[PDB]
Amino acid sequence: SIQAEEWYFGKITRRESERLLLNAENPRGTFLVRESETTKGAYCLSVSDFDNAKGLNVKHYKIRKLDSGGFYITSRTQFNSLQQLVAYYSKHADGLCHRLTTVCP
């Protein structure tokens, strides 16, 4: 039940996710999951990053959900639940800007 998830922010806009994430106290990997503003059935994983090039910045990744059941950012790496997808990316950066570290305050 993704709505019970503390990292699930529900129906918030892309700009509002960036407002929350661009806080200086946030370390790399601070994240939240929200509904897509325009892709029915998809969610967006919003993640903070930091470098000397860009300073504090935010990346957005689309999480797809098949009616067949799997959740995924890349079709080659699927999960039975959004929760498992979050747990996997908390340990593997893979193609993300950073591994998921802390739930956005």
Swiss-Prot record:
Taxonomic superkingdom: Eukaryota
Modified residues (Phosphotyrosine): Y43
Ranges for domain SH2: 7-104
Annotated tissue distribution: Expressed ubiquitously. Expressed in the skin (at protein level). Platelets, neurons and osteoclasts express 5-fold to 200-fold higher levels than most other tissues.
Intracellular or extracellular location(s): Cell membrane; Mitochondrion inner membrane; Nucleus; Cytoplasm, Cytoskeleton
PTM summary: The phosphorylated form is termed pp60c-src.
Entry's disease: SRC kinase activity has been shown to be increased in several tumor tissues and tumor cell lines such as colon carcinoma cells.
Subunit (UniProt): Part of a complex comprised of PTPRA, BCAR1, BCAR3 (via SH2 domain) and SRC; the formation of the complex is dependent on integrin mediated-tyrosine phosphorylation of PTPRA. Interacts with DDEF1/ASAP1; via the SH3 domain. Interacts with CCPG1. Identified in a complex containing FGFR4, NCAM1, CDH2, PLCG1, FRS2, SRC, SHC1, GAP43 and CTTN. Interacts with ERBB2, STAT1 and PNN. Interacts with DDR1, DDR2 and DAB2. Interacts with CDCP1, TGFB1I1 and TOM1L2. Interacts with the cytoplasmic domain of MUC1, phosphorylates it and increases binding of MUC1 with beta-catenin.
Record's comment describing the protein's domains: The SH2 and SH3 domains are important for the intramolecular and intermolecular interactions that regulate catalytic activity, localization, and substrate recruitment.
Function (record text): Non-receptor protein tyrosine kinase which is activated following engagement of many different classes of cellular receptors including immune response receptors, integrins and other adhesion receptors, receptor protein tyrosine kinases, G protein-coupled receptors as well as cytokine receptors. Participates in signaling pathways that control a diverse spectrum of biological activities including gene transcription, immune response, cell adhesion, cell cycle progression, apoptosis, migration, and transformation.
Further remark: May be involved in blister formation in Pemphigus vulgaris, phosphorylated-SRC is abundant at blister sites but not in normally adherent tissue, which corresponds with loss and disruption of CDH1 in cells adjacent to blisters. Phosphorylated SRC is increasingly abundant at pre-lesional sites of blister formation and occurs prior to changes in abundance of CDH1 and DSG3.
Recorded family membership: Belongs to the protein kinase superfamily. Tyr protein kinase family. SRC subfamily.
Protein name: Proto-oncogene tyrosine-protein kinase Src
Source organism (scientific name): Homo sapiens
Lineage: Eukaryota, Metazoa, Chordata, Craniata, Vertebrata
Covered residues, full protein: 145 to 249 of 536
